[PDB]
Design a binder for this molecule. Structure first.
Ligand SMILES: Nc1ncnc2c1ncn2[C@@H]1O[C@H](CO)[C@@H](OP(=O)(O)OC[C@@H]2O[C@H](n3cnc4c(N)ncnc43)[C@H]3OP(=O)(O)O[C@H]32)[C@H]1O
Ligand SMILES: Nc1ncnc2c1ncn2[C@@H]1O[C@H](CO)[C@@H](OP(=O)(O)OC[C@@H]2O[C@H](n3cnc4c(N)ncnc43)[C@H]3OP(=O)(O)O[C@H]32)[C@H]1O
Ligand SMILES: [Zn+2]
Ligand SMILES: [Zn+2]
Lengths: 615, 615
């Protein structure tokens, strides 16, 4: 019922196409013949003129192939063959391929094309000596009547190799992508050319990718991302080696990674240098600006020789914050520079903490929050890069409830929680900046543990808002236990003492509660050995091996004076033996513990999977 | 430095093997020849005796392959070819394939085996007609001096076309898996056979699997299991159609699915029929056996016309339980029969609930729990089928704390919690029966909500043990909220009223808390419309669409008189439009919400993925 085209190759022995056209069962239409320059085709044309008028025979010749000496012209013939198969518009269900005729390599190319593109039947024809000729027991060369006689009395074989399936993306495709060129053209006869070997590279790379995927099909659920299955064996072996922070190639690779940020404070971004000057030279009221004064950093501040405690760590960012963000222009400018920095670092999703009520003097905290939200929305709408018309970096908001050692600090917590609930219920567009949770931070000790604020957070739990708690930075595991089991926290920050209790660590691992680590902040405050030279070993590797969803963050960019890339590199330095697959696992954990919707999570997963740079 | 083996076919034209042997810049060792028993090889051995005495060539002839008549001859030649390639412990980098000689199909199969097995070089040799012969302009015939003369004068071309890579898991295989027979054994010349076409089927399956995987590479993250990527397009389309409970094929497919059980009561298994008699005829002391009396079931009990309340449902299983299980023989037989039923149903992992203290009259509850654990452990050890030497079904234990409307029940709750903690601390082997959590079931109302039992479960939370709660079966969403946020429940049972509160549903979906539903029990107690003909619609589809991890279980197998297959089919009946992929998603959710270790979870994931039957 199908059209049943017949593709055949021709050598220097004519009367092959007449034999192949005669098939016990096939009603062939539109016979196609592929041949070189020298063979003659008069006999075939006479056959199809006298015995089958309606078969509209077409003959194609390769432009510059007449005798093969090297491999260069074989590649030309193969490329022209592939484009010639592609030139017509036929599915595999109506393709019959005959490999008889031509050089020994031409038949191999015939079968390779048939098994790659797909065909209904691959076969070849044989005939034995039956004609007396001038020399006894001679093959029937010509003089069609003896070919028909041999068919009728019946010794022709027609060995049927069988059907072929073909790769699915190559079954149809299009010929406009890979066209041919006609050099000279007479009736039903052509000479053709191809500019390049694009189809060869396309086919080769798709087969190579398929071979790699078949090679890496096991150990797939252990892989953080699916695209890693398309990597070569050498690349995968290199991925399992320990990361070397000194090597510039490793630094470039880490800088080229898509990243997710979950712990970043807005008030500690621009505290020194040119960034502070740029923020200051944007105020609407320059008259009321406080006099410029930069706190002096300790010796070798990025990597101090001695640890320092919290008080001067907070005082080190006195040049920015409440003293400076009280001006609306400064707040806007701060937001723009933070978004620019996040985009430059390669982050694709970030959550930013803020304390709007600290910046309200004549305006309400609602106005401050609206200003921050509008500035971030305008920044996201400005940079419509990335595929699908989505912002380069998506920013969500988290509000901070601060607790202090003494004074008046507990009314502000209530104001922040109420504002967070109202704002979360106000803005609800999925593809926009939103308030997605609250955070309990500040001074921590025995008297300010988590279970003393349950009555304040009951309303937050009633309204359905996510909660993160700072715990374990300067306390034992009891604070972490109370945060987990009394405030129903979903994420923990600076849980450095989680390893003191095995049962608590098992509970955190089993419940999927995320942990956030900041290598620079932890090293600068608690002190830690570097390069394997009494706080103890850094607990990153222990958490990774135990099964905890641990992530690496930046905390205060300005105060600690570094970014995500530097934090990852020092994470490698603090735990010798850390691998690159561990970095990918960290990114996967950050994706899984984010405070986002399911569709956004899937989109981020796809975006990160295809963005990992190769060695 | 490689050995550089050479493989070449030969037809009715000698002096081709010596020409291919003289490949420039290649020192060959142990050249191999494949023939069709028709031609002669005297020339080959004569040449290798005089000009290369250290190459120890071999010659092979194919199993009565006289001439090409039909396709069976070609198939036998191809099978002998593949087994001949395998029966030489050779790597990809030292194979050199020459597709010169024999039929066109012979050279084509040469190239096919080269590109599948991954040769290191494929080439084709040509010669120039430079010999006088008896008629001028002749190819160089048998004699060797003229072959050497033509090599010296530069009349050989050696068209060589690229190396090959080959599929990775097929690069080695092993000779002792598709062996060759030896019909006749003469010096350096052999005739070989092959029992069957096993390698052909192996290769066809491999290529088809690779092609299907390449066809379905996208939409892989959405697939619950990876093996679904190896299904054909028709099967995948059939997977998305709505389930038809009336179709016998669908019934067989559901019965053939690997399953996970998470809500099963031990005391409600054998309550009627032959199973109850079998349990009764196992007592150590039949004198104290209470008289037999089976409660009568309502009309059309499996699908009753009107719902019944909990009291009659519980009284329906009075023939078994506390009255019967105080005798250890009956308890042991009960456990054996339940494990047999679970294996028959196809369950690969199950968690069983029990109340040992209810069966302690002269023995301690510790002895009863030890007997139950020993019975299940012995049952697991006995049936060590399945790959890896693992038990067919793995059973873990959960202990019930029962609350009642009036009477003395809190002491029993404290007893059960303490026993659970001690038992969980006692048995710690990963590949063994273990106690993994506690349950809060029984009578529920306003006065017996979850937050009235916090002080009793604080110890369980300190020791790090999983908790599940019966909530929502006969209460509004307030009970579910209290269970989630005051008792830190990890999984909920019969949460039929979760949809009344949107915030609670969103929180449950975000936190990953599991929900268990029992179709038959829910229909029998609450009443629900069937086939889409006021309790409202059954909430399976809403929970699935909202992202809640929802699973389907059996509750009481005996009282409700149904199994997992019946429950899944009735779930399809309760929500028209339920698809088969939805059943797979339910299985994945059950796997994700279980109380097991990570290694066991990975093993179960692989086992379920590699065991889904095809349509
Ligand atoms: N000392 C040797 N003695 C004998 N054979 C040798 C020797 N050394 C190498 N070989 C090769 O081994 C195959 C012997 O079967 C031959 O390979 P192949 O050249 O590919 O033969 C195929 C035939 O060449 C013929 N055709 C010659 N021109 C052309 C041409 N320009 N377009 C297409 N076909 C050509 C074809 O016409 P067709 O279909 O009747 O048969 C083929 C020989 O070239
Ligand atoms: N009307 C036609 N006119 C011309 N050619 C026709 C016609 N009908 C079919 N063909 C086929 O088309 C190819 C000619 O280009 C031939 O196919 P092929 O049988 O594969 O020929 C290859 C040669 O058969 C020869 N060898 C004859 N015995 C055997 C045998 N028992 N083991 C292996 N090879 C055999 C081989 O010696 P070698 O290495 O010099 O070249 C091959 C012809 O048989
Ligand atoms: Zn912080
Ligand atoms: Zn139950």
């Amino acid at each position: 019922n199908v059209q049943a085209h017949l593709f055949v190759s021709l050598g220097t022995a004519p009367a092959i196409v007449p034999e192949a056209f005669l098939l016990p069962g096939a009603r062939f239409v539109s016979v196609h013949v592929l041949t070189t320059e020298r063979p003659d085709v008069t006999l075939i044309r006479e056959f199809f003129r006298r015995h089958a008028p309606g078969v509209n025979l077409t003959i194609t010749r390769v432009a510059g192939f007449q005798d093969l000496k090297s491999e260069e012209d074989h590649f030309r013939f193969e490329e022209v063959m592939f484009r010639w198969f592609l030139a017509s518009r036929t599915g595999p269900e109506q393709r019959f391929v005959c490999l008889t005729g031509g050089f020994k390599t031409m038949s191999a190319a015939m079968q390779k094309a048939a098994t790659v593109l797909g065909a209904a039947e691959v076969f070849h024809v044989l005939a034995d000596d039956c004609c007396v000729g001038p020399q006894g027991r001679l093959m029937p060369p010509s003089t069609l009547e003896e070919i028909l006689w041999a068919r009728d009395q019946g010794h022709l074989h027609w060995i049927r190799l069988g059907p072929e399936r073909g790769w699915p993306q190559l079954r149809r495709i299009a010929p406009e992508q890979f066209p041919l060129q006609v050099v000279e053209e007479k009736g039903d006869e052509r000479r053709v050319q191809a500019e390049d070997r694009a189809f060869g590279t396309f086919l080769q790379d798709l087969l190579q990718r398929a071979s790699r995927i078949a090679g890496a099909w096991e150990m797939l659920p252990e892989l953080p991302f699916a695209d890693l299955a398309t990597w070569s064996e050498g690349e995968l072996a290199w991925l399992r080696e320990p990361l070397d922070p000194r090597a510039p190639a490793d630094q470039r690779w880490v800088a080229g990674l898509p990243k997710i940020e979950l712990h970043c404070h807005l008030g500690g971004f621009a505290t020194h240098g040119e960034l502070l000057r740029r923020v200051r030279n944007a105020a609407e009221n320059p008259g009321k600006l406080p006099p410029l004064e930069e706190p002096r950093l300790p010796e070798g501040w990025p990597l101090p020789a001695q640890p320092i405690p919290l008080a001067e760590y907070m005082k080190l960012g006195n040049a920015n914050g409440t003293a400076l963000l009280r001006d609306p222009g400064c707040l806007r400018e701060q937001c723009r520079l933070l978004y620019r920095h996040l985009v430059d670092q390669g982050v694709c999703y970030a959550e930013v903490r803020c304390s709007p009520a600290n910046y309200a003097e004549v305006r309400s905290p609602w106005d401050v929050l609206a200003d921050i939200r509008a500035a971030f929305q305008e920044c996201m709408e400005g940079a419509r890069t990335a595929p699908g018309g989505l912002p380069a970096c998506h920013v969500n908001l988290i509000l901070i409830a601060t607790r202090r050692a003494s004074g008046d600090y507990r009314a502000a917590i209530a104001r922040h929680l109420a504002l967070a609930v109202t704002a979360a219920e106000h803005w609800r567009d999925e593809n926009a900046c939103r308030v997605v949770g609250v955070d309990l931070a500040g001074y921590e000790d025995e008297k300010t543990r988590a279970h003393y604020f349950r009555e304040e957070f009951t309303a937050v739990h009633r309204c359905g808002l996510a909660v993160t708690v700072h715990a374990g930075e300067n306390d034992d595991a009891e604070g972490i236990w109370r945060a987990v089991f009394d405030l129903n926290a979903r994420r923990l920050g600076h849980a450095l003492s989680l390893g003191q209790s095995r049962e608590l660590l098992r509970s955190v691992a089993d419940r999927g509660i995320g942990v956030e680590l900041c290598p620079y902040a932890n090293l600068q405050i608690k002190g830690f050995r570097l390069d394997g030279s009494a706080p103890g070993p850094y607990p990153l590797l222990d958490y990774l091996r135990e099964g905890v969803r641990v992530t690496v963050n930046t905390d205060n960019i300005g105060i600690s004076a570094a970014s995500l890339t530097d934090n990852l590199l020092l994470a490698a330095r603090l735990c010798p033996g850390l691998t690159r697959l561990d970095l990918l696992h960290l990114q996967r954990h950050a994706l899984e513990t984010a405070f986002c919707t399911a569709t956004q999570r899937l989109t981020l997963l796809r975006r990160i999977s295809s963005g990992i740079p190769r060695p």
